[PDB]
Amino acid sequence: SSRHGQKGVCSRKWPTIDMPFSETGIQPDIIINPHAFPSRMTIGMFVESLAGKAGALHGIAQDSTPWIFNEDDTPADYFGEQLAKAGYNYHGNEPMYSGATGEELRADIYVGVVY
Amino acid sequence: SVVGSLIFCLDCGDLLENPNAVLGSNVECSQCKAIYPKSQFSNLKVVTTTADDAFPSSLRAKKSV
């Protein structure tokens, strides 16, 4: 589970070769199905993904106490600035290639690091 | 000594019995046994009105807000 009440049982141990790999060679270690979010509305996990990506890239730690951001300091924009400066996608997406077909997927995949 | 249907002793403060519950012509205090004539108090009138939360009616709701 993450830190947003997202349970999950490991359905299968996906071999690393069949695992989708990214442009940089990073194969993620955990897949979470995107269909969970529209009903759960845990946007905190989405924000935490790119915040952690920026933190791991820049070797820093970002505080996540509630009620630091507001309507005019959206955390998505704030961490997207850092991601763009680091050189990744401003929206947190990341080009990815299927591990079986080897071809680039239709759209850039949302990838990050979460606790 | 008197406020409503109450008669209070002016010496000690005990509650004298009702003038309709005594033999007559005087009332004796139950503590200091002082003499109070049956006169000096004859109309123990009280006025009581029911609360506004006693008769909930649709018309009353039209008299509010």
Binding site: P38, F46, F69, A76 | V65
Partner: protein, 196 residues
């Protein structure tokens, strides 16, 4: 989850009209004429009596809930279909909402545009004995925001009072889940025993 600059401008412009919704609803409920400033002593006394009794409080809560629900429906209709930075079918959230794969339109609107008005059991948020729905609010407040109606969205966060109200609604749901899980076995068993 994002929105275009024009879409955010529309949403903010419509939300700016929700400032006086609570005061207008209160003025209508208290049978007072409009234009009444929010600090009128007669309005305060009438709100006090409405809080004291249990039926006028329900009536006022229903009226204010209807008004703020009209406002949030306006925001939803104006923003959700043609206000997003990414459009269908590129918008994956909109795709899963439309295709019924998971979630729904109210979920997407809560995420992106507005979290709406909180309702625990067909009514607005409970009030203190003094007429304050929360320590942060003036006694006998006339405001949609200080009534459980939250203007935040799950993409851009919610202020602490709105967070409190949302937690309250979640608690109501959590209790009702247990009750609904508990409330069927005897009926099922007796019917099948009779009709076996």
């Amino acid at each position: 989850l994002r929105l275009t600059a024009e879409g955010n401008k529309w949403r903010t412009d419509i939300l700016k009209t929700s400032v006086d919704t609570g005061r207008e609803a209160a003025a209508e409920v208290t049978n007072l004429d409009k234009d009444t400033p929010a600090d009128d002593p007669e309005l305060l006394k009438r709100l006090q009596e409405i809080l004291r009794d249990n039926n006028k409080s329900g009536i006022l809560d229903a009226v204010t809930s209807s008004k703020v629900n009209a406002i949030t429906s306006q925001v939803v209709s104006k923003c959700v279909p043609d206000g997003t930075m990414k459009k269908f079918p590129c918008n994956s959230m909109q795709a899963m909402a439309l295709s019924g794969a998971k979630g729904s339109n109210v979920n997407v609107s809560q995420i992106m545009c507005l979290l709406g008005q909180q309702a625990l059991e067909g009514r607005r948020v409970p009030v203190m004995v003094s007429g304050k729905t929360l320590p942060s609010f003036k006694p006998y407040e006339t405001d949609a925001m200080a009534g459980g109606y939250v203007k935040g969205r799950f993409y851009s966060g919610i202020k602490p009072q709105e967070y409190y109200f949302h937690c309250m609604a979640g608690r109501e749901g959590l209790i009702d889940t247990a009750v609904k899980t508990s409330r069927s076995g005897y009926l099922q068993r007796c019917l099948t025993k009779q009709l076996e």
